[PDB]
Amino acid sequence: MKRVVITGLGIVSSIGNNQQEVLASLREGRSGITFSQELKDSGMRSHVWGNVKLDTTGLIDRKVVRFMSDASIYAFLSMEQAIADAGLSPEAYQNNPRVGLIAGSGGGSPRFQVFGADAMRGPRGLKAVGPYVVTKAMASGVSACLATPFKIHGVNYSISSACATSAHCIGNAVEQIQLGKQDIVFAGGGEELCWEMACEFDAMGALSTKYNDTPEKASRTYDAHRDGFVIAGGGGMVVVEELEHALARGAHIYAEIVGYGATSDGADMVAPSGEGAVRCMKMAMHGVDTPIDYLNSHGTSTPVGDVKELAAIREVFGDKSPAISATAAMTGHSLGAAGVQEAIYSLLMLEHGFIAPSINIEELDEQAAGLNIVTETTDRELTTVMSNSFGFGGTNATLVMRKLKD
Amino acid sequence: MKRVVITGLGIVSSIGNNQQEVLASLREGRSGITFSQELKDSGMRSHVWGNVKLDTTGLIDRKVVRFMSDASIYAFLSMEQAIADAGLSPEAYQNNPRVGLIAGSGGGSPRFQVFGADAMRGPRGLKAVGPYVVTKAMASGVSACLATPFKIHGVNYSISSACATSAHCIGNAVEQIQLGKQDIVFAGGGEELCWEMACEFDAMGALSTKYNDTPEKASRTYDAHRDGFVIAGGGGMVVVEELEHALARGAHIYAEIVGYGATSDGADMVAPSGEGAVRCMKMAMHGVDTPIDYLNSHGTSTPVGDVKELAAIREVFGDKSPAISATAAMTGHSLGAAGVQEAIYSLLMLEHGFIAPSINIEELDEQAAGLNIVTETTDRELTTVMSNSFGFGGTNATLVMRKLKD
Ligand SMILES: *C(=O)CCCCCCCCCCC
Ligand SMILES: *C(=O)CCCCCCCCCCC
Ligand SMILES: [N+]
Ligand SMILES: [N+]
């Protein structure tokens, strides 16, 4: 079939507003977690989050941004970055049936959905709601709000799968190219950050609550004292392109997507079975004749999740386990945007030959012994990398990226 | 080059709780629209909707339904029907890596999102929210809540694209089979019905408001006096299966999916360009050398939308325009669930050899002159049918289904 590569990337995360700032953070093992007065004031127990430190005011045309929620905004900015980074101009990607977009979010826009209901219940009713809430709150917001202004004519929809959302978007973009339907597909996603959505995770005891006094230490994947993930927001976009098309235009190729796994646990609603992850990674590794040098785990810093994934990793690789680090210990978990942002962190590590450190591991978990968990920025010539993304509903996604021969 | 067929269906709509009840409604041109005190009490101008006339209490295991919102419930029930209709036993589709599920909703669950925020702001805070709001409100709720209890091991995620959602879910399912990755994929979707979501549409003037005293006449696609669509809820699911696999087990085949189109307008955020729909239908018709005997239009009864689609149809078929009817005039528009429900209506028409009437046309719009809009139930031996689905963000989907030879 057709080979697929990544020729551009864009990102807005808790550790950087572009790939340069992100690279700097990854290398330094810098945390993007800060104290949130908003979460505290809402009555939550978790008072920390991975927020985007950027004033998006006036960065998007007024007539365009009026239909957008934060998830769409973060993704839109990420896409602008990706387009430039890919060296693409309007004449090449706009009004072109061979160019599409697949990007989504985990929950659309809880903030505007609540805004809509709150306004409607007010004395002005419909007049207070306004005519822009639907595009801001609908689940497809991220794809709709980008495909329209960027004049995309190809495929256009969002894939949603909880914390695996943007990982499946990328995988599906790869499939569109392998099917020969598209030459280029912008893939990724975004997720807003707000108490409206965060309080639901706190309500199920999934968020960290014992480290509010020391925010940068809250997310501590694999640490024996971890107590839940740190919610984060942001966006990310990658330019997925057919190999010949990319070579023909002299594009800059970060890596080739040589593996994509998507499976289902068919077990628990909010807990991983591990069995699904094993099949997902094996699927992504099928046909890959090179060993996995680095593995960017899902590792959101949860008691069960963290170790369940490691057990799955041991089952897949056995004794030949790759180097592992959970970037979430620095950035927090951006839910729907986690898949693309982590794929990007992995691509930056591959591009710059280094392994980001898995921070805040003061006491390694016993069930994490016998594995190579990197806790310090390590320079190394990586060739093949793997990134895992798991979401509620037993949904699993795995991406394997490899450098292209010279 | 795998061929794909539909071997089972399930549905919960405003016009029936199973395929038999729906068949009867379609043949009788019976409206599923009723007056809604809920919408009126909320302060809306639109007081009509296509509600599901069924008490779902106790129809799903307590431990399972606790994680579900209405969209998931409708889809779940639809899937139970589809499984039985397809004649699939547990050991045939469960714990099987070759069996997946792709289903979504247009907006997850506005009701539970608002519920969570409301509860959180109350005197009980987190305790009032409970630990089940995330799985109910997340955009992937429909796929997550079904893949888990049905023991799905293959693909598992939701495709979301506003009012084209379930149509893209079906198309993606076809793609998974064509890629040889799955032998069976349950595809479809669901959408809850509530003022929390409906008021947002009324706020942009998209819903009918001039026929509240005569509910069954509110949805009137192609009528010169149409004034917006009638919001509806419900679910639908179809069993997408590889041909050889279906034949081998002696499955009942409704039709083969011979065409699937998915395009983007790249124009207006909440209005169709028409140009995108032309490309979508043409894409779905590629290689289809049989004429379209019946076209189930998106036709949601909107001023601009109704005629824009007819213009696109004229451009695609020219002087060879097919018989057309908008089932939405009877059922209302179920948003994310519309795609699969309309594909099911089309399959029932194909299976039973008849064309459902496009009701409530008291005065045909002038821009619809010269077309074959069926306004009376008409028996006819159909062979190839087409169904269109369009959504905000300029997202387009078209499905073409054809009876298998003998
Ligand atoms: C990751 O799998 C955990 C679940 C994330 C679901 C997406 C975010 C849902 C927000 C709306 C519900 C609060
Ligand atoms: C169809 O294209 C019109 C848009 C449908 C969106 C359905 C989901 C909306 C959820 C958010 C409402 C404020
Ligand atoms: N990851
Ligand atoms: N349709």
Swiss-Prot record, chains A, B:
All copies of domain Ketosynthase family 3 (KS3), residue ranges: 1-403
Superkingdom classification of source: Bacteria
Gene Ontology CC: one annotated term: cytosol
Entries under InterPro entries matching the protein: Beta-ketoacyl_synthase, Ketoacyl_synth_AS, Ketoacyl_synth_C, Ketoacyl_synth_N, PKS_Beta-ketoAc_synthase_dom, Thiolase-like
Keyword Lipid biosynthesis: yes
GO molecular function: 3-oxoacyl-[acyl-carrier-protein] synthase activity
Keyword terms, alphabetized: Acyltransferase, Cytoplasm, Fatty acid biosynthesis, Fatty acid metabolism, Lipid biosynthesis, Lipid metabolism, Transferase
EC number: 2.3.1.41
Any Pfam family: ketoacyl-synt
SUPFAM superfamilies: Thiolase-like
Compartments, as annotated in UniProt: Cytoplasm
The keyword Zinc is assigned to this record: no
Catalytic activity: a fatty acyl-[ACP] + malonyl-[ACP] + H(+) = a 3-oxoacyl-[ACP] + holo-[ACP] + CO2; (3Z)-decenoyl-[ACP] + malonyl-[ACP] + H(+) = 3-oxo-(5Z)-dodecenoyl-[ACP] + holo-[ACP] + CO2
Residues annotated as catalytic: C163, H298, H333
Subunit comment: Homodimer.
NCBIfam families reported in the protein's UniProt record: PRK07967.1
Family the entry assigns: Belongs to the thiolase-like superfamily. Beta-ketoacyl-ACP synthases family.
Its job: Involved in the type II fatty acid elongation cycle. Catalyzes the elongation of a wide range of acyl-ACP by the addition of two carbons from malonyl-ACP to an acyl acceptor. Can also use unsaturated fatty acids. Catalyzes a key reaction in unsaturated fatty acid (UFA) synthesis, the elongation of the cis-3-decenoyl-ACP produced by FabA.
Name recorded for this polypeptide: 3-oxoacyl-[acyl-carrier-protein] synthase 1
Gene symbol of the encoding locus: fabB
